UniProtKB/Swiss-Prot annotation:
Organism expressing this protein natively: Homo sapiens (Human)
Reaction(s) catalysed by this chain's protein: Hydrolysis of (1->4)-beta-linkages between N-acetylmuramic acid and N-acetyl-D-glucosamine residues in a peptidoglycan and between N-acetyl-D-glucosamine residues in chitodextrins
Role, per record: Lysozymes have primarily a bacteriolytic function; those in tissues and body fluids are associated with the monocyte-macrophage system and enhance the activity of immunoagents.
EC number: 3.2.1.17
Cellular component GO terms held in the UniProt record: azurophil granule lumen; extracellular exosome; extracellular region; extracellular space; specific granule lumen; tertiary granule lumen
Name this protein carries in UniProt: Lysozyme C
Family: Belongs to the glycosyl hydrolase 22 family.
Amino acid sequence: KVFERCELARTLKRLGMDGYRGVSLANWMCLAKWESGYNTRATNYNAGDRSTDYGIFQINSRYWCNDGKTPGAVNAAHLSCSALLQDNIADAVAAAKRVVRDPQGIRAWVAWRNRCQNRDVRQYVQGCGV
């Protein structure tokens, strides 16, 4: 499922993401936008280390979800990577919460540093009613 901007905004808010561990809703929106373009079935294989990024938040198979084919994998979120490809993003949100719960925070996603950090991110939630 490819989410519409405000539709996603309200969903994340309902799922308790606004201000989770200091991360504003606008920041989560900026992250989802650049990671997958609000697409829940987005997958990205990293040929370099044999891991795959899954779902709307492009969560990595080496540490957060288990896909069985990633070498040296650990399952920190303890979910099947398949759960992160659903239209319902409850599990993807729970995995995202687990990721930022680690010392790097939102910085864990390099895309956030490149395209969201130190920028005006209000535009991602503007007009959405959140």
